[model samples]
Target: MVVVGLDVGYGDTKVIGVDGKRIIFPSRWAVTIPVLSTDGGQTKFIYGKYASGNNIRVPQGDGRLASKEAFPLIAAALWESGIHVDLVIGSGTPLGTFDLEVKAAKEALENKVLTVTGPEGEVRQFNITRLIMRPQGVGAALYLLNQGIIEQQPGYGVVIDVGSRTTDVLTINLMDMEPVVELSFSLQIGVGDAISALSRKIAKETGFVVPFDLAQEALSHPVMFRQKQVGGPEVSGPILEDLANRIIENIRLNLRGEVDRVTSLIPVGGGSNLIGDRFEEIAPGTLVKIKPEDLQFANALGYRDAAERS
Candidate 1:
């Protein structure tokens, strides 16, 4: 039996497959115009790599599982991960909707057959032999605990996961050895928020519509459009800063007095990495560490951990 942890977020799909195999790609798909030269002239859809175009379709929050493109993306994950049969899968739900839609998410994928066609015309058939669901930030928490990157002291530990569309904040009571969730919620700001804004800013200034996916590069690198720079980190940096400040302020407002009792404030997720050390401002002396490599996969990796045990 093989187990895989698949995280299909608004922007990225991360899968941890058998034998430590890991695959990460944009949670994107696109319809292609068939040329007479390829695949007997049938118009086919492609996913992940090389799927870029104006017709690219991206799944937004809550609708991911139900999205018609979802199964194709799932099939891409399975095919790319090289898992052909007998699978036990562990997946996640955002903490904000964990209770309401978690079971629905499982029901959507569980016992259903997924059909996918590779870019090279390879056809694949897959299904979920078994399924398990873990909450978003909860999975990150388990991974951090297993990693010993953070601890459950006498006080509380707060985890901030900035996703593509929502930032999930989980307050875990550290008084218990098992680490129980105290309060959990989500903010509607994520890296996608900044990315879209930046893309619009570039279009407004340059008259060229930058692909939101490529615009994400403006946060770190110079985005080239026709031999000219559209916008650099200077443009997106402040956008990201505002996002971080908003998330921090909300943490204080929602967590309230408990924020003061937090012994450790850990930030995870792609947005957390994008915002960088600004999270340190949340608490004066609170230990805030944002490791990009680990933050990006914290949830998926932990979900994989859960699958191993099952």
Candidate 2:
């Protein structure tokens, strides 16, 4: 059976197939009614780059995993991956929402057919035969083990997944690859929060309202503001540094002075790149494993790996 892993992150949707194929796209959906073509054909819902509507749908909170807003993102991933057959799917939820939404998220996708329009306006459909939900950090741990980046046994480690909506902190007994549940939790502070703060700061300084999309774009590269190119470091550097400090402090608070017990610090996700060095300062001699190129897809790849093993 075909196996696929889907991570509908707040910032982007990542998908990995058993065949080693991967796809990534912004997690934005635009609702559109059927429109007649000049050739007398009809168009379905538009999404991603091809979407022309302004009524975009973006996930704001915990309910995202269980809401209908997730469907289009899932369908878009399947479409982009060129997966069409019935398949087993694996997915994840943030640590804070795992217990509360995993089952609902599973039920929402299992044994279902998703139909949507792709970027090229082609009709796309996906048949999911089974679904498995895992906590976000667990997927990163599994991914690292599969990559042989870290030993699968005889140690203790932590997985810090800096996502858009939440940062998932998971302490694991590497011997069994299982989480030290009592030490794992999700913090509300995330990259999105930083983006919001930076946007506000920019507006306050320049009197130019930077929308969330523009703010996100600025995080990676220079952005044009009032016909002038503004570098991210020059505009948001302090904000990002402060955000990293806050994340480190929060981790310290949660660990309660037991931080030294962690032998490995695996940071994964898009936001990880921004705060990786901060973690090194906190862990001192601990190994910090972060693959910047593969960070965003780590969880999805791990989920696919787990599904295949099962």
Candidate lDDT (C-alpha), each: 0.73, 0.73
Q: What tens-digit string does per-residue lDDT give for candidate 1 at 151-173?
A: 66687777788888888887777
Best by TM-score: 2
**Residue pairs with backbone atoms closer than 3 Å in model 2 (clashes):** none
The number of clashing residue pairs in model 2 is: 0
CA deviation > 4 Å runs, candidate 1: 32-44, 53-56, 62-67, 115-123, 176-182, 203-207, 288-290
Worst 10 residues of 2 by lDDT: 33-42
lDDT of 2: 0.73
Compose the digit string of candidate 2's lDDT tens values, residues 1-310: 7788888887788888647787777777775522212111243355555555567776665325667777666666676676547778887876665676877776777777765543335554557787777778788788878788888657678888788877778898888888887888888778987788867777677777776677777776767766755448666677778878888888888887678677888888888877665677767666656568788888888878778788
The residue pairs found clashing in candidate 1 are none
